Amino acid sequence: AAQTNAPWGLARISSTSPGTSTYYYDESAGQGSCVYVIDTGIEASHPEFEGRAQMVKTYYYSSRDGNGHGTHCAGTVGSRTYGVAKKTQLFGVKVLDDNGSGQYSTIIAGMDFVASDKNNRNCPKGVVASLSLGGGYSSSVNSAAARLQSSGVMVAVAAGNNNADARNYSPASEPSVCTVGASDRYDRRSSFSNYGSVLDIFGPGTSILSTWIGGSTRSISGTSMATPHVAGLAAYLMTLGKTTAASACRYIADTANKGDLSNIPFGTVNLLAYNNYQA
Ligand SMILES: [Ca+2]
């Protein structure tokens, strides 16, 4: 399949070179997989989701996304126009309030929630969780991310936006999950992207067009934007049968575009998510 004039990030994930605008992907498009977006929620009614999105949990007085960030991330995972995995099932878990803030205890409960909740969902091709959030190092937050992964969910987490070593952030610093840095359309490390040995992969993170609340669309930037590219990619590869939740991060690193990014600090992986799709 080919989607012309796609957001640059989608084109990038299916290309061996920057500077192209068509997204190429197998038509299976993550059908039969599920991706949890653990965030400010998802505006499931957005036409872009086509009835494939649903709020399944909130820790606040509403499950609505009153911010937009969660809806943006979900859009990058699996919206029809802006998504990597255009046929995945999207489940929203609102651990962040409408200001985009959340206590670590709530974030933890949301991760443990998903580890159980997948047993209440139909995801024959496998389960992914996208966590575009973080804060200072917490062993408890890392452990919750580790549990979710161990439970059989491909966990993708943002490296963080501090232009700093991700070792000091959580869940970014958890070795057992997939930590995602951000790049721009010229294959530069995004100026804000964290780096470090704890990173596993990079994805498009600067000037990313996706869904927003009020049935709208928006371009924003962050490792929050890179993460769902990787989450969507995992879901897509899982429905293709190429990998599983336990090894998807390794598979993505193994099949990534290598050595192509600029301003990658010494000791950080130079790997950019790539679907290796031959149309
Ligand atoms: Ca890892």
Side-chain angles (χ1 to χ4, degrees), residues 1-63 65-277 279:
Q3 172 196 355
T4 57
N5 299 300
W8 78 263
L10 297 193
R12 194 63 191 88
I13 278 219
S14 62
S15 185
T16 47
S17 59
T20 71
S21 56
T22 306
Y23 176 39
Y24 309 105
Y25 61 98
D26 187 279
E27 355 274 308
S28 57
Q31 197 134 251
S33 68
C34 302
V35 184
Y36 288 81
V37 177
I38 304 174
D39 210 286
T40 61
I42 309 174
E43 185 172 280
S45 66
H46 193 125
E48 276 284 313
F49 297 122
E50 306 181 297
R52 295 178 286 103
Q54 253 187 198
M55 285 306 301
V56 300
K57 182 68 174 187
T58 181
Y59 296 88
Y60 306 89
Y61 330 80
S62 177
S63 69
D65 184 8
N67 182 283
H69 169 97
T71 291
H72 200 272
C73 294
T76 295
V77 175
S79 65
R80 159 197 32 135
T81 307
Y82 311 98
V84 174
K86 299 172 188 303
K87 281 71 169 304
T88 197
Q89 286 288 135
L90 294 162
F91 301 121
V93 177
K94 183 166 170 64
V95 300
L96 302 184
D97 65 21
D98 287 344
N99 295 137
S101 291
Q103 342 125 20
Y104 267 169
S105 188
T106 293
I107 289 166
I108 285 163
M111 283 193 267
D112 286 323
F113 168 77
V114 176
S116 182
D117 187 70
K118 65 170 173 62
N119 299 132
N120 291 332
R121 308 303 163 189
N122 239 58
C123 314
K125 298 298 182 182
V127 183
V128 184
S130 196
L131 283 128
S132 293
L133 51 72
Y137 181 87
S138 166
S139 64
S140 298
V141 172
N142 283 12
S143 179
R147 292 193 293 280
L148 182 53
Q149 178 68 50
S150 68
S151 82
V153 175
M154 189 285 181
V155 183
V157 311
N161 304 323
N162 315 277
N163 185 211
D165 195 308
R167 67 155 52 118
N168 291 130
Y169 299 95
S170 291
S173 62
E174 165 54 33
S176 74
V177 303
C178 210
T179 304
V180 184
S183 63
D184 74 15
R185 74 176 46 239
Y186 303 102
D187 283 353
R188 296 182 288 240
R189 175 175 61 90
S190 302
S191 57
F192 51 79
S193 180
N194 286 172
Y195 49 83
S197 63
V198 68
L199 273 67
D200 300 278
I201 192 66
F202 281 82
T206 302
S207 291
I208 304 299
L209 179 59
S210 190
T211 40
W212 200 256
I213 56 172
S216 56
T217 59
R218 211 103 145 174
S219 179
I220 60 170
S221 302
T223 57
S224 198
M225 282 65 259
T227 302
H229 285 264
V230 172
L233 177 59
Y236 164 88
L237 293 169
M238 285 158 60
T239 77
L240 278 180
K242 298 284 192 190
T243 193
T244 66
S247 48
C249 188
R250 272 162 98 153
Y251 180 91
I252 291 167
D254 286 353
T255 60
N257 283 128
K258 314 186 172 65
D260 297 326
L261 293 178
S262 63
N263 200 16
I264 297 300
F266 197 81
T268 292
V269 299
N270 198 147
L271 302 169
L272 179 64
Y274 172 50
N275 74 183
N276 284 257
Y277 178 63

